[PDB]
């Protein structure tokens, strides 16, 4: 029983509703996914064919708070319904950067570090998100914790070449623009570079295909040299020239990160 377990509220295109689990008044998000619109499918351990998004959410569901938790799912004649965690109070990182403009580097450091841990968590679980961007990152404003959301463009992590993609073009790497291929980790690092520039300059650096493949990064905001260098490194044109996740977290700009609660007390309360 789906409508008998959740009190459904208002919208949050895309069809996600605010909800409360009647059991315990827990805030949830209720996401509807039309079967006709589903790119990749997967099979659950039961063999029950489900959307790949459900498969990926289950593989990352193991307890670490950096990734959105899938709480339940239902099948309907023409759709799947996903019951997802909803922090409250919350704001996604896109609206947060819109309202506040370029972030202080201290705050961008904490956020970016939390995104890095969350993406490491996905990869450790065999999951490639493929749509990292500020819109797909939620800020729990009281805990100061970031949540990665919307795995609807993701895929199982593999080491061979990808030739499909359904993420956000302005966050896709030049090898996707030019040759329709990429490898998972190095394409994720590129999108992390776009994300980092987005945090410290107040918007993404590239809107057009020629800018993406141009390999030129102009800084519109005062940004420290160490941060510019990390950004430029993540945005290396050659995928093999990009840093590993470990190289990113050992970079000098990434040292002395704030704890989530410090981040909430200093920058969010």
């Amino acid at each position: 029983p789906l409508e008998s377990q959740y009190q459904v509220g208002p919208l949050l295109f895309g069809s996600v509703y605010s909800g409360i689990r009647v059991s315990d008044n827990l805030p949830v998000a209720i996401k509807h996914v039309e079967k006709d619109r589903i790119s990749d499918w997967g099979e659950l351990p039961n063999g029950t064919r489900v959307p790949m998004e459900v498969v990926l959410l289950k593989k990352v569901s193991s307890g670490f708070s950096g990734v959105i938790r899938l709480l339940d799912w239902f099948e309907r004649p023409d759709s799947f319904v996903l019951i997802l965690e909803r922090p409250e109070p919350v704001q996604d990182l896109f609206d947060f950067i819109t309202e506040r403009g370029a972030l202080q580097e201290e705050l961008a450091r904490s956020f970016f570090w939390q995104v890095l841990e969350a993406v490491r968590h996905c990869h450790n679980c065999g999951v490639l998100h493929r749509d990292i961007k500020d819109e797909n990152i939620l800020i729990d404003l009281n805990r100061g914790e970031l949540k990665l959301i919307d795995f609807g463009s993701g895929a199982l992590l593999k080491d061979t070449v990808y030739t499909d993609f359904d993420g956000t073009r302005v966050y896709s790497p030049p090898e996707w623009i030019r040759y329709h291929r990429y490898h998972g980790r190095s394409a994720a690092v590129w999108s992390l570079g776009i994300l980092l520039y987005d945090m410290v300059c107040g918007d993404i650096p590239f809107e057009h295909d020629e800018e993406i493949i141009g390999g030129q990064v102009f800084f519109r905001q005062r940004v420290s040299s160490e941060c510019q260098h990390l950004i430029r490194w993540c945005l290396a044109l050659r995928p093999s020239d990009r840093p590993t996740f470990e190289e990113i977290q050992n970079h000098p700009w990434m040292q002395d990160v704030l704890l989530p609660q410090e981040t909430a007390e200093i920058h969010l309360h």
Binding site: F94, E135, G202
Partner: peptide, 8 residues
């Protein structure tokens, strides 16, 4: 300069 969301 107009900042915008970008559908996937």
């Amino acid at each position: 300069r107009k900042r915008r969301r970008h559908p996937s």
